Symmetry: C2
Subunit: 46 residues, 2 copies
């Protein structure tokens, strides 16, 4: 696929977020991915 | 591994600027990653 992929390091979820299919991403990754809080993303291994 | 879909939530302040994504044990197992591995994140 063309262009630079957005790659991030996996860290464990905070306990209260576990089991909610949520991924915490900061504003810098959100800008590059092109998403806002509440949007959905695909996550896959590098 | 496989591709998963998750809802985006804000990062905690201490995680900001470290290129970190917080993913729970369920998504990690499905994706085929462990803590410290890298993932690609894409808008859907």
């Amino acid at each position: 696929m063309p262009g630079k992929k957005v790659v991030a390091r996996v860290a464990e979820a905070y306990a209260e977020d576990v089991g909610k299919r949520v991924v915490r991403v900061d504003k810098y990754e959100r800008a590059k991915v092109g998403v806002k809080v509440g949007d959905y993303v695909e996550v896959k291994k590098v």
